[PDB]
């Protein structure tokens, strides 16, 4: 049955749908169904809500805005914004150092009243640092189960077009991350990627993968 948390969530998502009219209907339908179910789920929860949004280059600004505003919509009943993390801010960096930074940022927020995070540009984290998402995204042993994490992946393709089905979009994201995380892997890091760890990460963050379309009213770079 529907809660006041969900009614606030729906209030905010309705506004988003009205502001961003260039999206696939299934973006809104499937993300709301997924996140409401988590918000409505009984305690104890077994897993955080983990939503993966992706986009091609021609939709970079929509990806950034809609991911953060959907995460804030999840938290609106709590009158706090989602935690913001950005992988473009981490790429040149020592993997173990980045892992400590991400862990501190997420844990500090989640311990102190915040219940969602947006993880922008997940593909740009140094590969080994992304092992921190086992702590936060594991199927049953995650550190905070009563939260949402919205992750984004910005593809290097110029456009997705509107013809792709979700299975093809998911394969694109999976394949692209495998390339990015192999490229940025540093085996001499304490935390380093390997094939089983990479597939395990993919399994834990790919529950719901949705594409985001361009919004010309965003080229401004200011969210609506």
């Amino acid at each position, epitope marked *: 049955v529907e809660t006041t948390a969900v009614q606030e969530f729906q209030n905010q998502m309705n506004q988003l749908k009205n502001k961003y009219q260039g999206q696939d209907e299934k973006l809104w339908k499937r993300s709301q169904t997924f996140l409401e179910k988590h918000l409505n789920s009984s305690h104890p929860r*077994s897993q955080p809500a983990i939503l993966l949004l992706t986009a091609a280059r021609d939709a970079e600004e929509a990806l950034r805005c809609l991911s953060e505003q959907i995460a804030d919509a999840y938290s609106s009943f709590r009158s706090v914004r989602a935690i913001r993390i950005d992988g473009t801010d981490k790429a040149t960096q020592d993997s173990d150092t980045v892992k400590l930074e991400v862990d501190q940022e997420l844990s500090n927020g989640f311990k102190n009243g915040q219940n969602a995070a947006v993880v922008h540009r997940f593909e740009s984290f140094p590969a080994g640092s992304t*092992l921190i998402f086992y702590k936060y995204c*594991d*199927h*049953e*042993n995650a550190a905070f189960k009563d939260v949402a994490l919205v992750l984004t992946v910005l593809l290097e393709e110029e456009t997705l077009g509107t013809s792709l089905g979700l299975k093809e979009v998911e394969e694109k994201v999976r394949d692209f991350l495998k390339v990015k995380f192999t490229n940025s892997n540093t085996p001499n890091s304490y935390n380093h990627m390997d094939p*089983d760890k990479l597939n395990g990460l993919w399994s834990r963050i790919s529950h719901l993968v949705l594409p985001v379309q361009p919004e010309n009213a965003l080229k401004r770079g200011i969210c609506l």
Partner: nanobody
Amino acid sequence: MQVQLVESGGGLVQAGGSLRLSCAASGRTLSSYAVGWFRQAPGLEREFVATISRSGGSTHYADSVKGRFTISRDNAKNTVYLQMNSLKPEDTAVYYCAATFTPDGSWYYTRGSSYDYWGQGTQVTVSS
């Protein structure tokens, strides 16, 4: 190559008896995987039975089988076991072994949705 699971040890027993299910893993080292046993009878929901961490150090059991069943693993022989004692008709079902990678040696999984690999199942029938 992905890991492959093959369960054996099923069969028919009268209530009160015992069975020992085994699952042999091929293609990958079993020590890579947390392992779970699940069971399903016709028309009913698949049920968690037991689970064991990669190290063997951590286990968990369904309330209905605790004290009767014991999950264990022999990573050297790439095999996992489910000792089933004091069997009851309520235990009749097809039993499946499942495996899933995790980087933490103590973590286990009690939900089937957590598991990537499954065996073909072995029938366990407990007569009344």
